[PDB]
Amino acid sequence: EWQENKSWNAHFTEHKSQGVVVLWNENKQQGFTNNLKRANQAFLPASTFKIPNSLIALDLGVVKDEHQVFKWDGQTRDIATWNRDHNLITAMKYSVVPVYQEFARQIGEARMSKMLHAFDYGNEDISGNVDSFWLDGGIRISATEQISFLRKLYHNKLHVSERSQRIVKQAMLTEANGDYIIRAKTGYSTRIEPKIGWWVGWVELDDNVWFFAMNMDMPTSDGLGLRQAITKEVLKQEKIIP
Ligand SMILES: O=C(O)c1cccc(-c2ccc3ncccc3c2)c1
Numbered sequence: 001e002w003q004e005n006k007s008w009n010a011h012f013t014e015h016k017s018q019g020v021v022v023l024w025n026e027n028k029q030q031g032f033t034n035n036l037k038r039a040n041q042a043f044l045p046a047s048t049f050k051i052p053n054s055l056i057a058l059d060l061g062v063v064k065d066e067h068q069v070f071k072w073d074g075q076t077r078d079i080a081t082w083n084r085d086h087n088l089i090t091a092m093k094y095s096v097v098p099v100y101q102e103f104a105r106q107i108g109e110a111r112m113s114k115m116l117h118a119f120d121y122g123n124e125d126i127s128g129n130v131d132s133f134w135l136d137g138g139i140r141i142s143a144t145e146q147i148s149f150l151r152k153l154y155h156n157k158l159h160v161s162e163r164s165q166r167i168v169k170q171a172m173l174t175e176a177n178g179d180y181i182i183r184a185k186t187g188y189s190t191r192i193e194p195k196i197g198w199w200v201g202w203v204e205l206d207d208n209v210w211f212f213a214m215n216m217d218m219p220t221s222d223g224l225g226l227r228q229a230i231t232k233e234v235l236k237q238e239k240i241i242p
Pocket residue numbers: 047079095097186187188221224
């Protein structure tokens with residue numbers, strides 16, 4: 001069962017923002033959100049799609065391991081961190097689109113489509129460009145669907161090797177200390193309206209896991225830091241992190 005906690009809206013309103021946060025208590029199998037409607041509204045995954053893309057590239061041998069270097073093609077793009085060599089860890093950390101567009105081309109439409117159906121990922125529709133459908137194509141996914149996919153990955157239940165799933169979960173590592181571990185992936189969709197930011201992942205505790213997925217209206221790149229800020233305020237309010 002799902003519970004709607006509209007008090008979280010305060011964290012969005014304080015920044016004149018609109019969005020949704022969805023949480024899932026794994027131990028209790030209970031979900032919580034500030035907006036049931038938007039939690040079930042499907043959006044472009046944008047760079048959150050690098051989770052399934054990584055999984056598929058690894059399982060098919062397109063990527064040998066997390067150390068294989070993907071060389072910069074020398075074409076200068078306006079994101080400084082993209083103009084250099086990367087491996088799977090750094091490409092994920094810096095959301096390096098062009099590296100993953102190359103992953104997608106080597107996967108191919110047929111294998112990509114079959115894999116996303118096996119993952120039951122979003123609408124499973126890669127209609128459009130094989131290498132950009134997650135940025136301007138037809139694939140859509142909601143916050144609650146993100147959680148369901150993430151839960152399978154955490155439990156190694158996706159239809160790829162255990163090894164592929166362990167490597168991707170390593171690459172998702174975002175923050176860790178004595179209080180919690182966060183494995184997550186950001187997203188920023190700008191080529192189709194409405195422009196939004198994503199943050200999806202989970203919080204590991206000593207004896208529980210809290211999965212989360214949030215998106216928010218992102219008319220300008222200036223509010224990107226709010227994806228994490230708002231999520232952590234919700235996590236603090238719910239006593240999940242200090
Ligand atoms: O957050 C992501 O996952 C992501 C993924 C791909 C691109 C960007 C991005 C693009 C333009 C920016 N322009 C200004 C400042 C920051 C910017 C970030 C972010």
